[PDB]
Structures are given as structure tokens and as C-alpha cells.
Amino acid sequence: ALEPDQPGYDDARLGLNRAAESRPAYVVEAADEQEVAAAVRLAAEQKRPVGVMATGHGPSVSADDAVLVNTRRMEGVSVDAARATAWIEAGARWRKVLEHTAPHGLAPLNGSSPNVGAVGYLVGGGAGLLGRRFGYAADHVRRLRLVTADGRLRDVTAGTDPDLFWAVRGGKDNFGLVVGMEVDLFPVTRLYGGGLYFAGEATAEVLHAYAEWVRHVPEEMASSVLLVHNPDLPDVPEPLRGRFITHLRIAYSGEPADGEHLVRPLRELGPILLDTVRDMPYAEVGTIHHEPTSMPYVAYDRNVLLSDLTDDAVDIIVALAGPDAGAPFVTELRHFGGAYARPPKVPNCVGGRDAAFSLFTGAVPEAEGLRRRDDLLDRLRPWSTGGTNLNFAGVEDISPASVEAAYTPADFARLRAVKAQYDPDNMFRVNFNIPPAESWT
Amino acid sequence: ALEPDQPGYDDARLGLNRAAESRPAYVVEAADEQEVAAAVRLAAEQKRPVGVMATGHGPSVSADDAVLVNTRRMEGVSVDAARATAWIEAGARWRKVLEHTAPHGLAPLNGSSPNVGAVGYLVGGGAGLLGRRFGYAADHVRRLRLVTADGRLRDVTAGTDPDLFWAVRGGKDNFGLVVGMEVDLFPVTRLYGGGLYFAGEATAEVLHAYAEWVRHVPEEMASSVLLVHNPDLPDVPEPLRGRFITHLRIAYSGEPADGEHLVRPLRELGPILLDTVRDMPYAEVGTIHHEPTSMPYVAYDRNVLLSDLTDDAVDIIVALAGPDAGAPFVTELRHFGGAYARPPKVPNCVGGRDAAFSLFTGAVPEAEGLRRRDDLLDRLRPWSTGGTNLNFAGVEDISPASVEAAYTPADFARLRAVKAQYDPDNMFRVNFNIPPAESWT
Ligand SMILES: *Cc1cc2c(cc1C)nc1c(=O)[nH]c(=O)nc-1n2C[C@H](O)[C@H](O)[C@H](O)COP(=O)(O)OP(=O)(O)OC[C@H]1O[C@@H](n2cnc3c(N)ncnc32)[C@H](O)[C@@H]1O
Ligand SMILES: *Cc1cc2c(cc1C)nc1c(=O)[nH]c(=O)nc-1n2C[C@H](O)[C@H](O)[C@H](O)COP(=O)(O)OP(=O)(O)OC[C@H]1O[C@@H](n2cnc3c(N)ncnc32)[C@H](O)[C@@H]1O
């Protein structure tokens, strides 16, 4: 339990995304599950809130005055090739999970970025490059080991505590900290994917075709569109530097033949500054988004879920987020539907299953820039479900009403009840917080 | 000691490049140095030859009737950040070395392909993407642990056995099997590199400019040119498929500013089908050549060293290896000079230091194809040093005269003497073999 101004406090308290500028009263760099339970026990004695950080990818509330458990040293993974499952400790990032599953020819339902904490991602739902085919990562869990608000370790399956197994798979840490989880693995060894990086002048054309194209693709095709002003930086090749880029991401988990057939029409649009679409070992999946996770940064994230992508919706995005807009934020359009739209084998509380698309924005916190982001998301409200994707929400989305928007009204009702039952003092509240039901007080 | 038709013989006997179709009398999958010494002791009892394989990247002679030591399980690496050195076990591939050195911001002098066995590469010399700046990997060794032909383990430094330290660093396994080595590490954290992938019609223009360009670059710029008929395969992006490609590889180990300045003129040539030149973590270095090492293959490798690349030399390469040639082999032109051309701090036997370029060919063994390869290398003999790069030699280069061409005449004289002294029965002869001096009998 490091305290402020002790050696390595800052090390253990600060994550990748610093937008929640937070100062925990103590930080425990847990080495194992016992240290996690001990940290939680301590906090319960001191009537203190408890938060958990594996990477700092997903900030929400300030950890001021809280105990923060840093799980980054708990990076254990083990694979059961026979049963096609992996055991993943609290702090294991997907890159490490992939190291272990690839030798067997197995893939988890990981996301766009290998740097991301597998557990935090999963308990938000977890929308990746196999998701349109298989669903949310939270829909494919065998069991959980959990530190509950009394500081007890508990093994949990759909069998032993339905309520808790349901709530944790989409509820983040609101019901306890996950020390390890057992996930189903899938026989995926290769992807046909990469990017079509179009010049700015093509943005309207591309987004219009994309809106149509997505209506015909199978569930094996995950795809998204990034719109970004790229700086003149050496970290990207010369065709992408210092200009507006519309980047179409492909991730087809079937045969390259099929993928290429689907993709080929998109090439008739242009000009294409760079084309990386290719057959790759699934291990290389993190090259499709190639998201920078080396330096810490501050970013204000916000997203809305779209019931549909229409011409007029496209035109708003072109106008407020395309080349001439001069928007100082990145915009990403991610395709959902498919398996995401169908109820999971084993129920969970993951919301937004009716969404066709996620529309995401990432912004340096600066008032002119945040205004334009606001204007863009407001102008899309008519094509919006009212929902937000929880894993793509940011530090501005911390109020109870903002968190409610991540769940269906019924799921949230039930979640409030379960929360009262498993976290009566609302100890896990350094998070996208589900408040205890008022009826349970 | 697996024998033929025992479970896992084929596993342990066959490597990546199968061009030496070899059947060892026994294969020892050594777990540690003691098993290696025991294997060598056994062979010395039985008057049998001994070969060593970590990956099968570098075949030469058939292992028929030999004992083969497979070192692939000896993959240990440890790094001394303070002293900037790594300890590398026999079988460790560069990818694993890189895993350990990158967290400290250190780089070994590895080569184009992370799949390659660090030790085998180094004892051939070892020409990589930092070589023009720092020299051969064999020029930066602190010590070796070696199993000599009596089966004894021996720690060797420039201090304790000058003759042996000299000979092993360029002599491959001719003087004993290396169980571990201690290499100097360099403070390189990033490269500016990648490819300019030009269409076939530009090949003459590019090779002519390259010939000139290389005369002005600093030692921080490693570069090469691949000429290849790419099949219509899904493993490469659509611009590179089913056509002739001239691929210019850049690897600048200075500041991106400097790299870009150097590279920019090359873009004035064209058309460029794809441009990947960018600032990257040095860990990603294996993306510059992106050589396929997943499937085994058969390949007949041959190279000649060039004293200079002239217009007429270029025109022969264009004519016999460029788009209209219909050559069924790959051709690679690699730039040497720089630190390679200067004597190493601590002497070694690595030859070809006077070469400006390596010209390499890789061929499926088929007589029409091998004829054209022969014709190309013969037609370049006037611009040739007479030498060959040992690490780039193949199964056709196994005769004493072919191996002599890898060393200066004096070095080879001395090498024959040392060989008689350390391997009097020529036990290590499943290799590019240095025969014992006749004067020592
Ligand atoms: C940064 C980022 C995030 C990201 C992404 C790409 C990047 C560059 N791509 C995603 C994608 O393709 N699909 C997706 O669904 N999400 C994606 N994300 C977001 C990511 O899922 C979330 O940010 C998630 O929170 C990441 O978890 P991580 O553990 O890495 O992050 P954290 O800040 O350290 O923790 C955030 C919250 O996660 C919950 N959490 C963390 N550990 C636990 C444990 N052990 N038990 C229970 N809950 C846990 C907490 O709520 C914590 O506050
Ligand atoms: C396949 C390949 C090779 C390669 C390369 C790229 C690819 C795809 N790029 C290279 C590069 O950029 N620069 C360079 O200098 N060489 C490059 N190579 C060639 C490589 O250096 C050689 O092929 C080398 O022989 C590789 O060694 P490896 O150990 O991987 O290969 P092997 O077939 O299993 O062994 C070949 C011979 O190496 C000597 N050897 C191997 N292990 C030992 C030990 N422990 N002690 C002593 N000698 C050893 C033997 O002579 C063995 O026969």
C-alpha cells in the first residue's frame, strides 16, 4: 500500500489515459489474488471506495481518497487446448493472452488493441474483430474468480450465483474485482484484414458506399471507419502524413477468397493512399487498428449508438467530422449487428444490442474542440438509440444518467437491485458506477 | 537420442529449409549444455560426424549417418542492462532475444528475420539492419561457452584462447558447438524503415538511382533491393499481387528527420505501389523484410560479392533478373561497406570485408531455373570479388573450394591450421566445412 509522495506511488497510480487526474489515498500493486482481497478488506474497514486499474485504458471517476488496486503484475495466462478455454489473471493484457492461444490455433474475443486489459474489456462487454461473428467477449465466459465487497474470494459460474455471473459480465467492477476468468476460445488462426486508407477528397463517397456495403456483408466481416486529421509525423508512412484520412478497417475471419470478393468493390472508390488488406496470422490482429499505446495521453471519449446509418446521418458526419470540418477530435464508425444483436447463450447485462453502429469520438479536452464534438453527437441524436457503448464511454459519462444509457431500462433496474445486494455501501464506485437501488436503500 | 522411425525423429531432424534432405543416425533434442556435451562425447566414441540445428535456416551438407544436435529447446536469454550485454543460449532465435532487450531500450545486431537462430547467424558473421553502422554481429562478442570435439565444455574469451575466439566468430560450428554466447548490446530503440514497393516498369530506373544513392548515404542507413515475381496470393496486399516487384528496404538507425531526407529523392522515381517507410520501435525490425518462415520449403541459395555496382552490372541484373527476364528465383541486392569494411575491435575470421554489395539468389531446385541463376551469377563475375557471404550460401556451396571463397586466402590458411588443432578428425563437418590443414594431416 503505497501512499502519496512514497517511492513508486506515481508509477502505480497513473495509467495510459490520464483524463481522470486521480490521487488514490493508497495504491496496492497486488502480486496475487490474496493481496487483492486484503486491499479490499482494508478499504471496507476504512469505509473507503475501491477502484481497480490494469492499464488505465478506461478511466471514468477520479480515484481521489480511494484505495486503488493496480493489477498489472498479475499477468498470468494458461490455456486448455483440449477444452478450448484460457484462464486469465486480473491484469493480463490481450497481447499476452494471444501469445498463449496462438500456438494452439485459438483466438479469444479480444479487441482492437493488444495493450488493453483483457478483464476490464470483458466485464464491459468487449467488442472486437471477431464480435460480429461470435458476439461480446462477455457472452463466452465459463467462470470467474471474484473478490467481493466483504473481501472474500469467490468462484462464480452461471450455476453457483446466476445474479452475480449475469451482472459482472457487463457490469465492470460494480459487483467485485475479478482476479481471474475462464473464457471460451475459438478456432481462428487467420484473418483477412488491414486498411484501405483513402484520401480526404473521397470521404463522402466512401462513407456513402460503406453505409450500403455493410447491409450485405456476413457476420464474418468486422469493419469500421476512422476519420482523422493525421499530423506530419514520422510514425506513419509518407502517403498518410499531414492530411485528412478516411481509414476503412477490414477484419474478415473467413477464407481470404470470400474476404477479397467482399472488399473488391470498395477499391473502385478512391484514391487509396495505402492498402494493407491481406491474409495474416490472427496474432497480428492488432495491426488493423494499430492504436498508439506507448506514451500516456489525456483523452475525452464519447460515443452514441446508431439505430441506422442513413444518407443524412452520413452527410452530418461528413460535414461535422470530414475533411473540411476542421474537427479537432477523431471519429470512428464501428459496425455492430450480427451476433451482437442476438441474446447470449448465457444471459448477461450487456446493453446496446439493438445498435447498428457505434459512433465514437476522442478529444483533447479543449472547449472549442469539445463544443464541436457535442454539436456532432447532438446532430446525430435523431439516428441514435439513446444508448452508449460502455467500453467506449469516457470521463464525461460518469453521472448516473450517463451510465444508465449503457444498459436497457430493465437490465439497469435489475442491476441496481443486484448492486444493493452485493455492494450495499457502494464501495465499487471508482468506475462507471451503477448506484444501489433506492428501494433497497 | 531419437533414431529413424522412432516417435518424433522427423520432428527433430527436419528444419525450415529442407534442401539438404538429411537423415541423421541419431537426433538429440538437447535440453541443456550437458546433453550437448554428452551428444558430442557419444559421437566421438562412435567416430561419427556431428551437426547442429537450431532452425534449419542455413542447411549445407546432408546429415546422413551423423549425430544431429537440435538446440531448439535451449532458448534461454538474459540481459545485463548495466553492462549492455545479453547471454544467449544455443537455440535462441532473435525474436526471443528482442523480447528481452527491447524493454531496456537495447538492440543486438540481429538480421532481417526474427525466426533465425541467433548463434548460427553470429558464428557466420551476421549481417543485419544495424550492420553498416556497427559491423558484423561476430565483431561484438564478449565470450562463448563451447562444446569442443572432445565433448568438454569450455568458456572462451579473446583472453583465454585467442585462436579459438577468432575462429568461432566466422567459422560456424567448425571448431565446436556454441551452447551460449555473450554479446554486446547497442542503445537503439527505433528505426526509420520499411519499404518502397515499386512497380516492375520502374526497376531499371530504381536500380540505377540506387547504385548512385548508396554512394552518399551514411553508415546509419542499411538498405537493400529485392526483385521478385509476386504470385497472386492473399498474404500480400492487392497492389503487390501477381506482378513483378522491386522492393527497396530502408533501415535508418538515426533520427527520422535524417532518414526522410535521405529517402525523399527515391520517391521521385515511381510508381510506388505501397510505401511503409516509417518510424517504428526497433522490436518491429522484422517487418522490413517480412520473410515467410511459417511453412518449410526447399531453396537453393547462392550469392556473389560485388566490388562495385556499375551501370553495366545494373543492366545485367535488369536483363537477367528484372521484369522481362522471367527469372524463376528471387534476387536481392544488399549494401555492405561502412563498419563491415573496417577491421573489428577484436580480430575474427569473417571474410568479404572488401565487398560493396551482396548479390543473393534463391531458387526452387529446377534445372531451367538453376541455369538462369548460374547465367546471372556468371555474367556478374567481372564485378565480383570472387568472394561469397557465408551466411547467404546454400546447399550447392559445400565443396572445399566454395567454402574457401567465403574467407580471405590468409584467413583460410590460418583457419585450416586451427581446425586441425581443435577438430583433428573433422567431426564438425555437417556444415560449410573448413577441412583440416594437410600440413597437420
Ligand atoms: C485504450 C483503448 C481501449 C479500448 C480499445 C482500444 C484502446 C487503445 N479498443 C476497444 C475495442 O476494440 N473494443 C472494446 O470493447 N473496448 C475497447 N477499448 C476499451 C476497453 O475495453 C475499456 O477501456 C476497458 O475498461 C479496458 O480495461 P482495462 O483494465 O484495460 O482498463 P483500466 O483503465 O485499467 O480499467 C478500467 C475499468 O475496467 C474495470 N476493470 C479493470 N480491471 C478489472 C478487474 N480485475 N475486475 C473488474 N473490473 C475491472 C473497472 O471498471 C476499471 O475502472
Ligand atoms: C532463413 C533465413 C536466413 C537468414 C536470413 C533470413 C532468413 C529468412 N537473414 C539473414 C540476414 O539478414 N543476415 C545474415 O547474416 N544471415 C541471414 N540469414 C542466414 C543465417 O544467418 C544462417 O542461415 C545461419 O546459419 C542461421 O543459423 P540457424 O541456427 O538459424 O540455422 P540452422 O540451419 O539451424 O544452423 C545452420 C548452421 O549454423 C551453425 N550453428 C547453428 N547452431 C550452432 C551452434 N549452437 N554452435 C555453432 N554453430 C551453430 C552450424 O554451422 C549449422 O549447420
Best CA proximity match to B207, nearest among B223, B191, B231? B223
Q: Which residues of B touch A238 (CB under 8 A)?
A: 260, 267, 275, 277
- Share in percent of chain A as helix, strand, coil (round to 5): 30, 25, 45
Give nearest CA residue, ligand 1 atom 11: A111
DSSP B104-118: GT-B----S-TTSBH
| Cα→Cα distances A172→A12, A219, A334, A348, A433, Å | 21, 26, 22, 12, 9
Nearest alpha-carbon partner for A43 in A20, A23, A25 = A25
Residue A21 grid cell: 487526474
Closest ligand 2 atom to Cα of B129: 12
Distance CA B15, CA B282 (A): 27
Mutant choice from A232, A238, A248 vs B, greatest count of B C-beta within 10 A: A238
Cα–Cα distance for residue pair B73/B90, rounded to 1 Å: 9
The sign of the dihedral angle between the CA atoms of B199, B205, B208, B214 is negative
- Per-residue cell: A144: 470467474
All three cell numbers of B270, joined, read: 515511381
A256-267 helix and A203-213 helix, angle to the nearest 10 degrees: 140
Stretch (H or E) spanning A252 = strand A244-252
CA distance A404 to B272: 51
Q: Is A436 in the pocket of ligand 1 (CB under 6 A)?
A: no
3-state secondary structure of B350: coil
Contact A358, A393 (CB under 8 A): no
Separation between Cα atoms, residue B383 and residue A144, nearest integer Å? 68
Q: Is the CB of A150 under 6 A from ligand 1?
A: no
Q: Which grid cell sits at B295?
A: 511453412
Q: What are phi and psi of A156, to 5 degrees?
A: -135, 130
Q: What are phi and psi of B427, to 5 degrees?
A: -65, -40
Give the whole-angstrom CA distance, residue B57 versus residue A102.
Answer: 23
Can you tell me the distance from the alpha carbon of B406 to that of B383, in angstroms, rounded to the nearest whole number? 17
Which residues share a beta bridge with A191? A280
CA angle B21, B27, B29 (to 5 degrees): 120
Q: How far is A158 from A164, CA to CA, in rounded Å?
A: 8
How does strand B50-53 pair with strand B67-70? parallel
Q: Please state, in angstroms and rounded to a whole number, the distance separating the CA atoms of residues A110 and A224.
A: 16
- B251 forms bridges with which residues in the sheet? B193, B222
B82 contacts: CB under 8 Å, gap ≥ 6: none
**Residue B437 has what DSSP assignment?**
P
Rg of chain A (C-alpha set): 21
How far is the C-alpha of B18 from the C-alpha of A199, rounded, in Å? Answer: 45
Ligand 2 atom having least distance to the Cα of B111: 12
Q: Could you count the other beta carbons within 10 Å of the beta carbon of residue B418?
A: 24
The grid cell for B381 is 563475375
Which cell goes with A81? 487446448
Q: What residue in B sits closest to A273 (Cα-Cα)?
A: B274
How close is the nearest chain A Cα to the Cα of B29, in Å? 20
Give the Cα separation of A335 and A193 in Å (integer).
Answer: 15
CA distance A117 to A121: 6
Residue A413 alpha carbon to ligand 1 centre in Å: 24
CB atoms within 10 A of CB A324: 11
Question: Do residues A119 and A181 lie in contact, with contact meaning Cβ atoms separated by under 8 Å?
Answer: yes
Give the three-state DSSP class for A81.
coil
Q: Are A172 and A117 in contact (CB under 8 A)?
A: no
Cell of B379: 555474367
Whether A4 contacts A23, CB under 8 Å = yes
CA–CA gap between residue A173 and residue A179 (Å, rounded): 11
Any residues with CB less than 8 A from the CB of A290 and at least 6 apart, and which? none
Please tell me which residue of chain B has the smallest CA distance to A275: B237
Is the preceding omega at residue B435 within 30 degrees of 0, hence cis? no
Where b means 16+ CB within 10 Å and e means fewer, B85-97 reads bbbbbbbbbbbbb
> Which residue in A245, A385, A377 sits closest to A316, CA to CA?
A377
* Contact indicator for A173, A51 with CB cutoff of 8 Å: yes
Cβ neighbours of A275 in B, within 8 Å: 237-239, 274
Q: Around Cβ A23, how many Cβ atoms within 10 Å?
A: 16
Amino acid at B432: F
* Position B321, amino acid: A
Query: Which strands sit side by side in the sheet containing B141-147, from one edge to the other?
Result: B77-80, B85-89, B177-184, B141-147, B153-156
Q: How far apart are alpha carbons A245 and A239 in whole angstroms?
A: 10
Ligand nearest to the Cα of B147, by number? 2
A294 inside 8 A of chain B by CB = yes
Q: Grid coordinates standing for B336?
A: 555492405
Q: Could you say which ligand is closest to the alpha carbon of residue A430?
A: 1
Mapping DSSP to helix (H, G, I), strand (E, B) and coil, where does residue A67 land? strand
Residue A276, chain B, CB below 8 Å: the answer is yes
Residues of A with Cβ-Cβ distance to B192 under 8 angstroms: 234
Q: Rounded CA gap, A31 and B288, in Å?
A: 38
Q: Are strands B26-29 and B67-70 parallel, antiparallel or unpaired?
A: parallel
Domains located in chain A, CATH noted: 9-70 (3.30.43), 77-184 (3.30.465.10), 190-396 (3.40.462.20)
Distances B25 to A120, B28, B50, B386 between C-alpha atoms, Å: 53, 10, 10, 36
Q: Are A181 and A145 in contact (CB under 8 A)?
A: yes
Measure Cα distances from A236 to A326, B88, B263 in Å.
20, 33, 15
B175-205: b or e for each residue (b if 16 or more CB lie within 10 Å)? bbbbbbbbbbbbebebbbbbbbbbbbebbbe
Contact A235 B281 (CB under 8 A): no
CB atoms within 10 A of CB A127: 27
On the 0-12 / 13-18 / 19+ scale of CB atoms within 10 A, B396 is middle
| Beta carbons within 8 Å of B340's beta carbon, 6+ residues apart | B127, B131, B132, B135, B136, B353, B355
Q: Tell me the angle at which helices B367-379 and B311-321 cross, rounded to the nearest 10 degrees.
A: 170
Contact status, residue B260 vs residue B192, Cβ threshold 8 Å: yes
SS3 B186: strand
Residues of B with CB below 8 A from A279's CB? 233-235
Among candidate residues A389, A294, A292, A280, the one with its CA nearest the CA of residue A333: A389
Decide whether any atom of ligand 1 lies within 6 Å of the A177 Cβ: yes
Closest CA to B173 of B87, B90, B111: B90
Rounded to whole angstroms, how far apart are CA atoms B58 and B391?
7
What is the C-alpha separation between A91 and B140, in angstroms, rounded?
A: 38
In 3D space, the residue among A96, A80, A252, A74 whose CA is nearest the CA of residue A183 turns out to be A80
Classify strands B77-80 and A67-70 as parallel, antiparallel or unpaired: unpaired
Cα angle at B137 between B134 and B142, to 5 degrees? Answer: 100
Q: CB-side exposure of A280: number of CA atoms within 13 Å?
A: 20
Coil vs helix vs strand at A51: strand
Is residue A111 in contact with ligand 1, taking CB distance under 6 Å?
Answer: yes
DSSP B72: T
Nearest ligand (C-alpha, residue B125): 2
CB B137 within 8 A of CB B88: no
Scanning B25-66, the segments in alpha helix (DSSP H) are: 33-45
Nearest to A234 among B233, B237, B278 (CB): B278
CA distance B118 to B97: 8
Question: Which residues touch A246 (CB under 8 Å, ≥6 apart)?
Answer: A197, A198, A199, A200, A202, A203, A206, A207, A225, A226, A227, A322
Kindly state the cell numbers that stand for B398.
Answer: 559445400
Which residues share a beta bridge with A297? A17
Which DSSP letter does residue B329 get? E
To which residue does cell 499531414 refer?
Answer: A242
Q: Measured between CB atoms, does B281 come within 8 Å of chain A?
A: yes
3-state secondary structure (DSSP) of residue B158: coil
Q: Which residue type does A116 have? A: V
Index of the ligand 2 atom closest to the CA of residue B55: 34
Question: What are the grid coordinates assigned to B328, written together?
Answer: 524463376
Q: How far is CA B92 from CA A410, B75, B112, in A?
A: 56, 4, 16
Mutation target for B interface from A196, A230, A235: give the one with most B CBs within 10 A.
A235
| CB proximity under 8 Å: B 242-271 to A | 256-257, 259-260, 267
* Separation CA B318–CA B375 (nearest Å): 13
Contact B67, B42 (CB under 8 A): yes
B274/A274 CB distance under 8 A: yes
Direct distance between the N- and C-terminal alpha carbons of chain B, in angstroms, rounded to an integer: 32
Strand partners, B191: B280
Other beta carbons less than 10 A from residue A19's beta carbon: 21
Q: How far is CA A155 from the centre of its chain?
A: 25
**CA atoms in the 13 A half-sphere facing the CB of A40:** 29
Q: State whether residue B237 sits within 8 Å of chain A by CB.
A: yes
* Deposited resolution, Å: 2.1
Alpha carbons A160 and A164: distance in angstroms, whole number:
9
Q: Report which of A87, A98, A95, A101 is spatially closest to residue A144, judged by C-alpha positions.
A: A87
Residue recorded with cell 513508486: A8
Cell of A376: 456532432
- Number of the ligand 2 atom closest to the C-alpha atom of B389: 15
Q: Do B235 and A279 touch (CB under 8 A)?
A: yes
Comparing CA positions, the residue from B14, B8, B18 lying closest to residue B394 is B18
Q: How many other β-carbons are positioned within 10 Å of the β-carbon of residue A31?
A: 11
Is residue A234 less than 8 Å (CB to CB) from chain B?
yes
Find the B232 Cα to ligand 1 centroid distance in Å.
40
In the structure grid, which three cell numbers stand for residue B348, read together? 575474427
Helical segments of A355-430, H only: 367-379, 400-404, 409-422
Instruction: Give the contacts of A330 (CB within 8 A, at least 6 positions apart).
Output: A226, A227, A228, A361, A362
Kind plus residue range of the DSSP H or E element containing B144: strand B141-147
Backbone angles phi, psi at B162, to 5 degrees: -45, -45
Spatial distance between the Cα atoms of A110 and A114, rounded to a whole number of angstroms? 8
Return the closest-CA partner of residue A355 out of A401, A394, A308. A308
User: Which technique?
Assistant: X-ray
Closest to A72 (Cα-Cα) out of A126, A30, A110, A25: A30
Pairing assessment for the beta strands A221-229 and A329-335 based on DSSP bridges: antiparallel
